[PDB]
Amino acid sequence: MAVVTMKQLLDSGAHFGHQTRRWNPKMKRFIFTDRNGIYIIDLQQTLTYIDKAYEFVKETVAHGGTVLFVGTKKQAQESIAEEATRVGMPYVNQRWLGGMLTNFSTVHKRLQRL
RNA sequence: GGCCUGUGUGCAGGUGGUGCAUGGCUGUCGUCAGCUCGUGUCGUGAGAUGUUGGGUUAAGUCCCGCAACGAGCGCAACCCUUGU
Numbered sequence: 001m002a003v004v005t006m007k008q009l010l011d012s013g014a015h016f017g018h019q020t021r022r023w024n025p026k027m028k029r030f031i032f033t034d035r036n037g038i039y040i041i042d043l044q045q046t047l048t049y050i051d052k053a054y055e056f057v058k059e060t061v062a063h064g065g066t067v068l069f070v071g072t073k074k075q076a077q078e079s080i081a082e083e084a085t086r087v088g089m090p091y092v093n094q095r096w097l098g099g100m101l102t103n104f105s106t107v108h109k110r111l112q113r114l
Numbered sequence: 115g116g117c118c119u120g121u122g123u124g125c126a127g128g129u130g131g132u133g134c135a136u137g138g139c140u141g142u143c144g145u146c147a148g149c150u151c152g153u154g155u156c157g158u159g160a161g162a163u164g165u166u167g168g169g170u171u172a173a174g175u176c177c178c179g180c181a182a183c184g185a186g187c188g189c190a191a192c193c194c195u196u197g198u
């Protein structure tokens with residue numbers, strides 16, 4: 001089950017890979033074909049994986065787990081920040097901090113100070 | 115009991131040695147700005163990061179990105195004097 005249509009996917013252009021100069025060989029099983037130095041990902045595998053992620057996230061919300069949203073690239077900072085704020089869910093989009101969750105005791109005092 | 119004159123007794127007395135056993139105190143590097151730790155992470159391991167690189171400063175002063183995030187001792191200032 002998906003909520004995003006194929007035509008919308010192609011219009012968005014999420015099927016493009018990086019150029020042939022920096023492509024990861026491990027993504028051979030996903031990249032479909034090359035066309036002018038650029039790669040294309042297998043859309044059907046994309047929908048299948050999206051479906052699996054959808055079921056997992058549904059299970060997560062079902063048993064009540066908190067999800068952390070992380071993204072630091074310049075382009076998507078505002079998008080992820082707005083989406084996380086609307087969902088009311090912690091996030092970060094400016095700069096990743098060293099082991100904030102792993103070393104949680106130190107950040108605990110930082111939160112109390114805040 | 116306070117006292118001291120004599121016999122003692124335990125005992126006082128030593129600038130006598132030993133600053134390569136020691137306390138305390140002190141000179142220097144140098145009033146130079148650097149010096150450590152908690153958590154985590156890389157390696158296995160000595161260890162490293164953090165403290166780096168760009169910029170800036172009298173200074174580890176501050177910003178930038180980074181497996182680093184913070185904390186401690188330093189520095190700045192809090193003392194005195196001088197200048198209205």
Ligand SMILES: [Mg+2]
Nearest residue numbers: 126127128130
């Ligand atoms: Mg004597």
Ligand SMILES: [Mg+2]
Nearest residue numbers: 127128130131
């Ligand atoms: Mg003697």
Ligand SMILES: [Mg+2]
Nearest residue numbers: 131132133134
């Ligand atoms: Mg001596």
Ligand SMILES: [Mg+2]
Nearest residue numbers: 143144146148
């Ligand atoms: Mg020194």
Ligand SMILES: [Mg+2]
Nearest residue numbers: 155156157158
């Ligand atoms: Mg390990």
Ligand SMILES: [Mg+2]
Nearest residue numbers: 162163164165
């Ligand atoms: Mg280090």
Ligand SMILES: [Mg+2]
Nearest residue numbers: 163164165166
């Ligand atoms: Mg280093």
Ligand SMILES: [Mg+2]
Nearest residue numbers: 164165166182
């Ligand atoms: Mg640093």
Ligand SMILES: [Mg+2]
Nearest residue numbers: 148164165174
């Ligand atoms: Mg240092």
Ligand SMILES: [Mg+2]
Nearest residue numbers: 171173174175
């Ligand atoms: Mg410096």
Ligand SMILES: [Mg+2]
Nearest residue numbers: 174175188189
């Ligand atoms: Mg400091």
Ligand SMILES: [Mg+2]
Nearest residue numbers: 189190191192
């Ligand atoms: Mg000071």
